[PDB]
Each structure stands twice: as C-alpha cells, then as structure tokens.
Short mmCIF file of C-alpha atoms in Angstrom, two decimals:
data_model
loop_
_atom_site.label_atom_id
_atom_site.label_comp_id
_atom_site.label_asym_id
_atom_site.label_seq_id
_atom_site.Cartn_x
_atom_site.Cartn_y
_atom_site.Cartn_z
CA UNK A 1 107.94 75.89 172.56
CA UNK A 2 109.41 75.83 176.07
CA UNK A 3 107.35 77.64 178.71
CA UNK A 4 110.59 79.22 179.89
CA UNK A 5 112.10 82.66 180.33
CA UNK A 6 115.11 83.94 178.40
CA UNK A 7 117.43 83.82 181.42
CA UNK A 8 116.17 80.34 182.33
CA UNK A 9 117.02 79.05 178.85
CA UNK A 10 120.36 80.86 178.95
CA UNK A 11 121.20 79.11 182.23
CA UNK A 12 120.55 75.72 180.63
CA UNK A 13 122.92 76.69 177.80
CA UNK A 14 125.67 77.51 180.31
CA UNK A 15 125.24 73.98 181.66
CA UNK A 16 125.82 72.56 178.18
CA UNK A 17 128.80 74.73 177.15
CA UNK A 18 130.24 76.44 180.25
CA UNK A 19 133.77 76.78 178.84
CA UNK A 20 132.71 77.90 175.36
CA UNK A 21 133.31 81.54 174.44
CA UNK A 22 130.00 83.39 174.71
CA UNK A 23 131.02 87.00 173.98
CA UNK A 24 133.97 88.39 172.01
CA UNK A 25 134.82 92.11 172.22
CA UNK A 26 138.17 92.81 170.53
CA UNK A 27 140.71 91.61 173.10
CA UNK A 28 138.11 90.41 175.61
CA UNK A 29 136.69 86.89 175.20
CA UNK A 30 134.11 85.85 177.81
CA UNK A 31 132.96 82.28 178.42
CA UNK A 32 129.41 81.23 179.21
CA UNK A 33 130.38 80.50 182.82
CA UNK A 34 132.01 83.94 183.08
CA UNK A 35 128.90 85.59 181.64
CA UNK A 36 126.61 83.51 183.85
CA UNK A 37 128.55 84.22 187.05
CA UNK A 38 129.02 87.94 186.39
CA UNK A 39 125.32 88.43 185.69
CA UNK A 40 124.52 86.34 188.77
CA UNK A 41 126.51 88.81 190.88
CA UNK A 42 124.73 91.76 189.27
CA UNK A 43 121.35 90.07 189.72
CA UNK A 44 122.02 89.69 193.45
CA UNK A 45 123.08 93.34 193.59
CA UNK A 46 119.96 94.41 191.67
CA UNK A 47 117.67 92.49 194.03
CA UNK A 48 119.56 94.03 196.96
CA UNK A 49 118.70 97.44 195.45
CA UNK A 50 114.97 96.71 195.16
CA UNK A 51 114.59 94.98 191.78
CA UNK A 52 111.57 92.68 192.04
CA UNK A 53 109.24 90.73 189.74
CA UNK A 54 108.50 92.77 186.59
CA UNK A 55 110.39 95.83 187.82
CA UNK A 56 111.14 98.18 184.94
CA UNK A 57 114.88 98.90 184.83
CA UNK A 58 116.50 101.33 182.42
CA UNK A 59 119.78 100.19 180.91
CA UNK A 60 122.07 102.64 179.10
CA UNK A 61 125.51 101.36 178.12
CA UNK A 62 127.91 101.48 175.21
CA UNK A 63 128.47 98.39 173.10
CA UNK A 64 130.36 96.25 175.62
CA UNK A 65 130.50 92.98 177.51
CA UNK A 66 129.10 95.06 180.37
CA UNK A 67 125.91 95.58 178.35
CA UNK A 68 125.44 91.82 177.96
CA UNK A 69 125.97 91.26 181.69
CA UNK A 70 123.57 94.11 182.47
CA UNK A 71 120.74 92.68 180.37
CA UNK A 72 121.19 89.20 181.84
CA UNK A 73 121.44 90.58 185.37
CA UNK A 74 118.24 92.61 184.99
CA UNK A 75 116.35 89.58 183.69
CA UNK A 76 117.79 87.18 186.28
CA UNK A 77 116.84 89.52 189.14
CA UNK A 78 113.27 89.37 187.80
CA UNK A 79 112.75 92.67 185.95
CA UNK A 80 112.44 93.90 182.38
CA UNK A 81 114.90 96.32 180.82
CA UNK A 82 114.37 99.55 178.88
CA UNK A 83 117.16 100.05 176.30
CA UNK A 84 118.35 103.66 176.15
CA UNK A 85 120.80 104.90 173.53
CA UNK A 86 123.68 106.80 175.23
CA UNK A 87 123.74 109.01 172.11
CA UNK A 88 120.14 110.17 172.52
CA UNK A 89 119.29 113.73 173.62
CA UNK A 90 118.84 113.93 177.37
CA UNK A 91 115.28 115.17 176.94
CA UNK A 92 114.56 112.08 174.83
CA UNK A 93 115.98 110.07 177.74
CA UNK A 94 113.48 111.60 180.17
CA UNK A 95 110.62 110.16 178.12
CA UNK A 96 112.02 106.65 178.64
CA UNK A 97 112.41 106.98 182.42
CA UNK A 98 108.61 106.75 182.60
CA UNK A 99 107.78 104.33 185.45
CA UNK A 100 111.35 102.97 185.56
CA UNK A 101 112.52 101.77 188.98
CA UNK A 102 116.20 102.63 188.46
CA UNK A 103 118.87 103.07 185.79
CA UNK A 104 121.72 100.63 185.17
CA UNK A 105 124.50 102.40 183.29
CA UNK A 106 128.27 102.85 182.99
CA UNK A 107 130.68 105.21 184.75
CA UNK A 108 130.94 107.87 182.05
CA UNK A 109 127.22 107.85 181.21
CA UNK A 110 126.35 108.25 184.89
CA UNK A 111 128.38 111.46 184.48
CA UNK A 112 126.94 112.63 181.16
CA UNK A 113 123.25 112.72 182.07
CA UNK A 114 122.81 113.16 185.86
CA UNK A 115 119.55 111.24 185.76
CA UNK A 116 116.38 112.12 187.65
CA UNK A 117 116.20 108.48 188.83
CA UNK A 118 118.22 106.15 191.02
CA UNK A 119 121.30 105.06 189.11
CA UNK A 120 123.53 101.98 189.39
CA UNK A 121 126.91 101.74 187.66
CA UNK A 122 128.05 98.40 186.28
CA UNK A 123 131.63 99.20 187.33
CA UNK A 124 130.56 99.49 190.99
CA UNK A 125 133.06 97.35 192.97
CA UNK A 126 130.27 96.28 195.35
CA UNK A 127 128.74 94.16 192.57
CA UNK A 128 131.87 92.00 192.26
CA UNK A 129 131.61 91.02 195.95
CA UNK A 130 128.24 89.28 195.50
CA UNK A 131 128.01 85.51 195.23
CA UNK A 132 128.69 84.04 191.79
CA UNK A 133 126.38 81.11 192.59
CA UNK A 134 123.00 80.60 190.95
CA UNK A 135 119.76 82.17 192.19
CA UNK A 136 116.09 81.27 192.26
CA UNK A 137 114.37 82.71 189.19
CA UNK A 138 111.10 84.50 189.86
CA UNK A 139 109.64 85.07 186.38
CA UNK A 140 106.96 83.25 184.42
CA UNK A 141 106.77 83.01 180.63
CA UNK A 142 104.30 85.89 180.35
CA UNK A 143 106.43 88.31 182.39
CA UNK A 144 107.73 91.41 180.63
CA UNK A 145 111.04 90.96 178.81
CA UNK A 146 111.77 94.53 177.69
CA UNK A 147 110.01 97.81 176.96
CA UNK A 148 111.31 99.29 173.70
CA UNK A 149 110.41 102.81 172.59
CA UNK A 150 109.54 103.84 169.04
CA UNK A 151 107.32 107.93 171.47
CA UNK A 152 105.53 104.83 172.78
CA UNK A 153 106.99 102.18 175.07
CA UNK A 154 106.35 98.84 173.39
CA UNK A 155 106.00 96.01 175.92
CA UNK A 156 107.25 92.52 175.02
CA UNK A 157 107.07 89.45 177.25
CA UNK A 158 109.50 86.56 177.65
CA UNK A 159 106.97 84.33 175.88
CA UNK A 160 107.00 86.44 172.70
CA UNK A 161 110.78 86.48 172.20
CA UNK A 162 111.19 82.82 173.21
CA UNK A 163 108.67 81.71 170.57
CA UNK A 164 110.57 83.52 167.81
CA UNK A 165 113.88 82.12 169.03
CA UNK A 166 112.46 78.60 169.36
CA UNK A 167 111.20 78.73 165.77
CA UNK A 168 114.64 79.96 164.74
CA UNK A 169 116.33 76.96 166.35
CA UNK A 170 113.81 74.28 165.37
CA UNK A 171 112.75 75.37 161.86
CA UNK A 172 115.95 76.95 160.47
CA UNK A 173 119.57 75.86 160.07
CA UNK A 174 121.24 79.21 160.67
CA UNK A 175 124.38 78.22 162.58
CA UNK A 176 123.81 80.43 165.61
CA UNK A 177 126.09 78.07 167.57
CA UNK A 178 128.93 79.46 165.43
CA UNK A 179 130.25 83.04 165.43
CA UNK A 180 127.54 85.71 165.01
CA UNK A 181 128.01 89.46 164.50
CA UNK A 182 126.12 91.81 166.84
CA UNK A 183 125.57 94.71 164.45
CA UNK A 184 122.18 96.22 165.31
CA UNK A 185 121.99 99.23 167.63
CA UNK A 186 120.75 98.45 171.14
CA UNK A 187 117.63 100.63 170.69
CA UNK A 188 116.24 98.27 168.01
CA UNK A 189 114.52 94.95 168.69
CA UNK A 190 116.66 93.02 166.17
CA UNK A 191 119.70 93.61 168.40
CA UNK A 192 118.28 91.21 171.00
CA UNK A 193 117.35 88.68 168.33
CA UNK A 194 121.06 88.67 167.44
CA UNK A 195 122.19 88.54 171.08
CA UNK A 196 119.93 85.82 172.45
CA UNK A 197 119.63 83.49 169.45
CA UNK A 198 123.42 83.22 169.73
CA UNK A 199 123.56 83.04 173.54
CA UNK A 200 120.75 80.45 173.73
CA UNK A 201 122.31 78.15 171.10
CA UNK A 202 125.90 78.09 172.38
CA UNK A 203 127.47 80.45 169.85
CA UNK A 204 130.02 83.25 169.98
CA UNK A 205 128.51 86.74 170.13
CA UNK A 206 130.83 89.26 168.45
CA UNK A 207 130.35 92.84 169.64
CA UNK A 208 131.86 95.86 167.92
CA UNK A 209 132.73 99.40 168.88
CA UNK A 210 130.46 102.21 167.69
CA UNK A 211 133.13 103.38 165.24
CA UNK A 212 133.68 99.90 163.78
CA UNK A 213 129.93 99.56 163.17
CA UNK A 214 130.06 102.84 161.22
CA UNK A 215 133.23 101.83 159.32
CA UNK A 216 132.21 99.48 156.50
CA UNK A 217 135.82 98.69 155.56
CA UNK A 218 136.68 97.80 159.16
CA UNK A 219 133.44 95.84 159.57
CA UNK A 220 133.76 93.50 156.57
CA UNK A 221 137.38 92.83 157.56
CA UNK A 222 136.55 91.79 161.13
CA UNK A 223 134.06 89.27 159.72
CA UNK A 224 136.83 87.91 157.50
CA UNK A 225 139.54 87.41 160.14
CA UNK A 226 137.18 85.87 162.69
CA UNK A 227 135.15 83.93 160.09
CA UNK A 228 131.85 85.28 161.37
CA UNK A 229 129.40 83.12 159.45
CA UNK A 230 126.07 84.64 160.58
CA UNK A 231 125.44 88.29 159.68
CA UNK A 232 122.48 90.54 160.52
CA UNK A 233 122.08 93.86 158.71
CA UNK A 234 119.13 96.18 158.07
CA UNK A 235 117.71 96.17 154.55
CA UNK A 236 119.03 99.68 153.91
CA UNK A 237 122.55 98.45 154.71
CA UNK A 238 122.42 95.71 152.06
CA UNK A 239 121.04 98.15 149.48
CA UNK A 240 123.91 100.50 150.34
CA UNK A 241 126.52 97.73 150.02
CA UNK A 242 125.41 96.44 146.62
CA UNK A 243 125.06 99.87 145.02
CA UNK A 244 128.82 100.48 145.40
CA UNK A 245 131.42 98.54 143.41
CA UNK A 246 134.01 99.28 146.11
CA UNK A 247 131.93 97.58 148.82
CA UNK A 248 130.78 94.64 146.69
CA UNK A 249 134.46 93.78 146.17
CA UNK A 250 135.20 93.82 149.92
CA UNK A 251 132.00 92.08 151.04
CA UNK A 252 132.74 88.82 152.92
CA UNK A 253 132.10 85.77 150.76
CA UNK A 254 132.28 82.79 153.16
CA UNK A 255 129.34 83.97 155.28
CA UNK A 256 126.79 81.20 155.72
CA UNK A 257 123.66 83.21 156.59
CA UNK A 258 122.57 86.84 156.24
CA UNK A 259 119.46 87.93 158.15
CA UNK A 260 117.79 91.19 157.14
CA UNK A 261 114.79 93.26 158.20
CA UNK A 262 113.35 96.72 157.64
CA UNK A 263 111.75 98.14 154.50
CA UNK A 264 111.10 95.97 151.45
CA UNK A 265 114.23 94.07 150.43
CA UNK A 266 115.57 94.79 146.93
CA UNK A 267 118.06 92.30 145.48
CA UNK A 268 119.70 93.68 142.34
CA UNK A 269 121.64 91.51 139.90
CA UNK A 270 124.98 91.89 141.69
CA UNK A 271 123.30 90.92 144.96
CA UNK A 272 121.69 88.01 143.11
CA UNK A 273 125.10 87.11 141.69
CA UNK A 274 126.65 87.23 145.17
CA UNK A 275 124.09 84.89 146.73
CA UNK A 276 124.32 82.34 143.92
CA UNK A 277 128.12 82.52 143.63
CA UNK A 278 128.95 81.77 147.27
CA UNK A 279 125.86 79.79 148.36
CA UNK A 280 124.84 82.39 150.94
CA UNK A 281 121.33 82.05 152.38
CA UNK A 282 119.60 85.42 152.68
CA UNK A 283 116.69 85.46 155.14
CA UNK A 284 113.99 88.13 154.90
CA UNK A 285 112.35 88.90 158.25
CA UNK A 286 109.33 91.06 159.06
CA UNK A 287 107.73 92.24 162.26
CA UNK A 288 106.84 95.35 164.23
CA UNK A 289 108.26 96.05 167.66
CA UNK A 290 104.89 95.06 169.15
CA UNK A 291 105.34 91.42 168.03
CA UNK A 292 108.97 91.11 166.83
CA UNK A 293 109.73 88.95 163.79
CA UNK A 294 106.67 86.89 162.89
CA UNK A 295 107.23 85.98 159.21
CA UNK A 296 110.40 84.77 157.50
CA UNK A 297 111.45 84.03 153.93
CA UNK A 298 114.72 82.30 153.08
CA UNK A 299 116.09 82.87 149.58
CA UNK A 300 117.36 79.65 148.06
CA UNK A 301 120.62 80.71 146.35
CA UNK A 302 120.52 77.78 143.91
CA UNK A 303 117.04 78.70 142.63
CA UNK A 304 116.02 81.90 140.87
CA UNK A 305 116.26 84.84 143.28
CA UNK A 306 113.37 87.35 143.38
CA UNK A 307 114.51 90.96 143.17
CA UNK A 308 111.71 91.85 145.62
CA UNK A 309 111.51 88.73 147.80
CA UNK A 310 108.35 88.30 149.87
CA UNK A 311 108.41 88.44 153.66
CA UNK A 312 107.33 84.80 153.69
CA UNK A 313 105.06 82.82 155.99
CA UNK A 314 104.11 83.03 159.68
CA UNK A 315 106.45 81.49 162.25
CA UNK A 316 105.19 78.79 164.63
CA UNK A 317 102.25 79.65 166.90
CA UNK A 318 101.67 82.80 164.83
CA UNK A 319 98.79 83.56 162.46
CA UNK A 320 98.70 86.37 159.92
CA UNK A 321 95.51 87.96 158.57
CA UNK A 322 95.24 90.45 155.72
CA UNK A 323 92.03 92.30 156.56
CA UNK A 324 89.94 95.07 155.03
CA UNK A 325 88.65 98.16 156.85
CA UNK A 326 85.86 96.02 158.34
CA UNK A 327 88.41 93.44 159.58
CA UNK A 328 87.09 91.00 156.97
CA UNK A 329 89.52 88.64 155.28
CA UNK A 330 90.85 89.63 151.86
CA UNK A 331 91.09 87.18 148.95
CA UNK A 332 94.52 86.26 147.66
CA UNK A 333 96.12 89.12 145.72
CA UNK A 334 93.99 91.90 147.26
CA UNK A 335 95.84 94.57 149.23
CA UNK A 336 94.90 94.75 152.90
CA UNK A 337 96.19 95.60 156.38
CA UNK A 338 98.49 93.22 158.22
CA UNK A 339 97.16 91.77 161.49
CA UNK A 340 99.39 89.57 163.66
CA UNK A 341 98.09 87.00 166.15
CA UNK A 342 99.60 84.27 168.29
CA UNK A 343 102.40 83.73 170.78
CA UNK A 344 104.46 86.73 169.60
CA UNK A 345 101.86 89.44 170.31
CA UNK A 346 103.13 91.71 173.07
CA UNK A 347 101.40 93.28 176.05
CA UNK A 348 100.87 96.72 174.51
CA UNK A 349 102.07 100.28 175.11
CA UNK A 350 103.45 101.29 178.51
CA UNK A 351 101.06 103.50 180.51
CA UNK A 352 98.88 104.19 177.45
CA UNK A 353 96.11 101.64 176.85
CA UNK A 354 93.80 103.94 174.93
CA UNK A 355 96.38 103.49 172.17
CA UNK A 356 96.62 99.80 173.08
CA UNK A 357 92.85 99.41 172.68
CA UNK A 358 93.17 100.91 169.19
CA UNK A 359 95.96 98.53 168.12
CA UNK A 360 95.47 95.27 170.06
CA UNK A 361 92.33 93.19 169.53
CA UNK A 362 90.96 89.75 170.29
CA UNK A 363 91.41 87.27 167.47
CA UNK A 364 87.95 86.75 165.91
CA UNK A 365 89.07 83.49 164.28
CA UNK A 366 91.11 82.13 167.23
CA UNK A 367 89.29 83.57 170.27
CA UNK A 368 92.04 82.57 172.71
CA UNK A 369 94.62 84.62 170.81
CA UNK A 370 95.69 88.27 170.90
CA UNK A 371 95.74 90.23 167.63
CA UNK A 372 97.88 93.27 166.77
CA UNK A 373 97.09 95.72 163.96
CA UNK A 374 100.27 96.88 162.21
CA UNK A 375 99.12 99.46 159.68
CA UNK A 376 101.26 97.78 157.01
CA UNK A 377 99.84 96.82 153.62
CA UNK A 378 100.36 93.36 152.15
CA UNK A 379 99.05 90.75 149.72
CA UNK A 380 98.69 86.99 149.97
CA UNK A 381 100.55 85.26 147.16
CA UNK A 382 99.21 82.05 145.56
CA UNK A 383 102.06 80.07 147.16
CA UNK A 384 101.13 81.25 150.67
CA UNK A 385 103.92 83.82 151.01
CA UNK A 386 103.08 87.37 152.08
CA UNK A 387 104.05 90.24 149.78
CA UNK A 388 104.93 93.28 151.90
CA UNK A 389 104.12 96.66 150.35
CA UNK A 390 104.01 99.36 153.04
#
C-alpha cells in the first residue's frame, strides 16, 4: 500500500480527473479541480491561523460541499480533524473540544454554540482570497487523520485509513469511480470510508440533506434518478427496509454494490430474493473505530445466501486473532475475543493512555505489529471466515 497521506492521494486523483464531478449536492456539482482549489485556499487560511503538523482541529458543519472542503483543507494544512455533530448537546460538544486548536464551522453553527475555543467560519470571505495553487504537504503516513469520539476520542492515522482504502481498490470491484451515496452521519467512521473511497478513485460523491437522509421515500428515489450504483447503509437500516413491504417495493434495483456495517447482518428471504433477482453484491464489513473496517465478506448473489453472513476475512496487512482470557489462540469453532493487528490499528485514545494500555497491546505473534482488543466475541469457521457474535 502507498506510504501516502489521504490528501496526497486525493491530489494525485485530481491530476487524473480534474474536470470530473467530485461532489454532487442537489443543484451544486463540484469538480475535482474545484474541490482541490477550494480546499487549497482553506488550507492556506488554516496555516495562516496557526494550523501546524498534527494540530487537532474541530470541524462542525451540516451535510454540505463546505464539509468536504473543510475536511480536505484541515488535512492539507497538516492537521487532523475532530468531527462534531451540529445536533449534539452543547455540553457534549465541550467534551470534544479537548486539546483542539480551533473549530472550523459554518455561519449558523458559529451562532448556535458560542464555542469556548477559537472559531473559523467556512463562509469567511478572507478564505476565498488565498491562492488556489498547490501547497507543500507536511504529513507523514503515521500522522493523525482524525479523532472520532464514541466518551473517548479514538485516534486514527493516515496509514490506517489508507490501508483499508487501498485494499478496497485493489481487492474489490466496487465501482467507487461511479456515483456513490454519502449516507452515514459525519460522527461515524463509515462516513469517511464513503467519502474518501469515492474521492480517491475518481467517483461522484452524492451528499444529501439531513431531511432526505431521514426520508426513506425521498432517499430511494434520489438513487433512482441519479443511478447511484454504490450504496452504504448501516445493518439496522437494511433490516428496517426488508421488514416492510412498502419499502421493499420502492428499494432501488439497479444498484451494483451495497456496503453494510454494524450489528450482525440478518438477510431474510425477501432480502435474499432481492440480491439474487438483481445481481446486487452485498458486502459485510466489520471493525471498531479504533481500527476501522478490517474484515470483509461479499455475498455472492448467484450462490446460496447465508441469512447470517459471516464478517469474512482480514483485509491486507491485517491479522485477526480469536483469543481466550489468557490471550491464547482458540481452536476453530470456539468462542473467543476479537483482537485486531496490523496496518489498521490506530494510535489509541486521546489524552487517556491508561485506557489505551488496557486495549492496545504488542502483537505476540508478529512483534513489529500493534494489537487492539475489541471486546467482541467471534468464532473461526472451517473456511477461514470469522463468525461475529457480539
């Protein structure tokens, strides 16, 4: 996998497809050059305001093209971002401003919260006066990418997310270069899997308003008009869809790939019928915020479809151990605790490494590697797939 940062790889994609549409938001359609230049201006502004290597920058925006520019600008300037839901209670916000240099937000959210930290608005007209030319990137692969809160601030490096994305490009044929729906809320780690696997493969990232994301009828229809062929929904969403006859009827049928994560996936007969009927590839993904997605399982729609599909096998440069309470390996079929090692393992919990010492270990079998203890229970299947239980 490339020893590159997310913004470095994004820049190389702008070189390949500068005039291709990168982001679609209702009326607004933004090209890769537009997205690159606008985030370049913000990155210059952010560095002018003190953003340096590995600076922790809070970002709180609604679903918008401005959010995409903000994330890219924060990474280009050299820092890591902390996603904050604008719908969260303003005491819950204060938790996330822990050790944050400044807050990048929008006009109305600068009003709503009156932060206890330095605040930059994306609509600031000073930003648009900065140079749209490229900049010198200052980050290495192991630099922090974001800090996501679950409340503990989970730290993930550029290396971890790049490895998952590189496996997605090299070892799967999900057409991320086509139109992809950005469904997941910005406070979840899957949201950035949707955003950057599309942006780093030349595809069209389709953003939606908060109300469209909550309107199932409006959502399925937008996929139909725009022919969005890659969909990403939580497991609970798919269970909700295929328990209602009304929604099964309206579910888009010419989608090429559906990616899902969350609790154990349950595929009832109508869901099984849907996948077989329309040749839709359902991908089961697993991973905690500390390591992101590390195992995948793609349901073959032409074979028999398991009603409880496994979470699959480790992605490249990732090793999975099912250990006992003494961290000894369990034989196939014996329930144990999931441990994750390899390139995806993050840096730990922000400003709390007593908890990090409890959850992050050295790999006893691969001494160079970092190991993370998930607390989830699983079984090795005889075919090498992992059965996720809890």
